Amino acid sequence: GSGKRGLAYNNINLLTAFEGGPFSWSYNWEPRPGGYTAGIEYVPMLWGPRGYGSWNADAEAGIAAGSKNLLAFNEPDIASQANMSPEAAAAAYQKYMNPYAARARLGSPAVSNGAPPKGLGWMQGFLDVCAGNCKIDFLAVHWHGPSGNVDDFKRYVSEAIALGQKYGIGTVWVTEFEGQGDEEAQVNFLKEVLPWLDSNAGVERYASFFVDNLVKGGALTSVGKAYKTI
Numbered sequence: 001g002s003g004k005r006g007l008a009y010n011n012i013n014l015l016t017a018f019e020g021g022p023f024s025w026s027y028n029w030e031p032r033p034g035g036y037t038a039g040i041e042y043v044p045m046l047w048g049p050r051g052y053g054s055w056n057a058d059a060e061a062g063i064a065a066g067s068k069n070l071l072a073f074n075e076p077d078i079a080s081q082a083n084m085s086p087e088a089a090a091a092a093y094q095k096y097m098n099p100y101a102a103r104a105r106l107g108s109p110a111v112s113n114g115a116p117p118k119g120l121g122w123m124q125g126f127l128d129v130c131a132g133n134c135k136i137d138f139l140a141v142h143w144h145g146p147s148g149n150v151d152d153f154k155r156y157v158s159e160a161i162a163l164g165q166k167y168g169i170g171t172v173w174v175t176e177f178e179g180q181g182d183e184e185a186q187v188n189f190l191k192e193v194l195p196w197l198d199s200n201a202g203v204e205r206y207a208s209f210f211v212d213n214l215v216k217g218g219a220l221t222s223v224g225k226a227y228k229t230i
């Protein structure tokens with residue numbers, strides 16, 4: 001396909017259900033993959049402070065396994081996720097990510113679609129605090145919301161793109177998006193956003209949220225099939 005579509009997982013076993021779909025990459029919100037999937041680029045994540053301990057070592061294995069890309073903290077703007085002030089993110093980014101700039105493309109901490117001061121407000125606070133010394137190849141962002149709130153999806157992604165470009169970061173990954181509701185409500189959403197994401201040159205890579213919910217009892221759900229074929 002576009003080569004932008006990702007497999008976001010917890011159970012590495014379930015990526016087989018997506019074999020031969022237009023997938024180039026995977027991540028699991030962890031620094032280590034828990035296994036191997038052939039022909040797809042695993043992307044390590046520095047989730048938050050709990051990972052600082054191993055991050056050196058973890059970035060080493062992954063670059064050593066040919067990983068082109070590294071991701072930073074998960075939802076520092078949400079208290080039960082990374083839960084990090086923009087200032088502490090800037091510090092820990094510069095410290096723990098910037099060092100791999102020569103060997104890998106670095107993805108920003110991934111914000112929620114929460115309104116300022118969460119979301120892209122936190123990104124701007126982080127981008128301000130970074131003070132042009134954070135080495136960032138791409139912004140990571142997330143959007144969760146009802147299936148019929150599709151417009152808001154696209155505005156958010158554009159606003160993330162606009163925000164990144166103002167700070168000289170030329171692309172975003174949408175590392176999580178989820179159009180909520182019953183199976184049909186979820187399909188139709190993917191029919192609208194997947195083509196839009198695939199041609200929107202502001203979006204380098206994306207992942208619907210997520211593999212483990214798109215498979216059930218070892219079988220693709222109907223949402224699974226749509227994500228695989230559209």
Ligand SMILES: OC[C@H]1O[C@@H](O[C@@H]2[C@@H](O)[C@@H](O)O[C@H](CO)[C@H]2O)[C@H](O)[C@@H](O)[C@@H]1O
Pocket residue numbers: 010028029074075081142144176209210
């Ligand atoms: O279970 C998938 C993955 O979820 C992460 O947290 C998510 C958050 O990233 C966002 O989507 O909000 C939802 C709703 O609460 C959270 O579940 C976890 O950080 C990660 O460790 C987990 O593997």
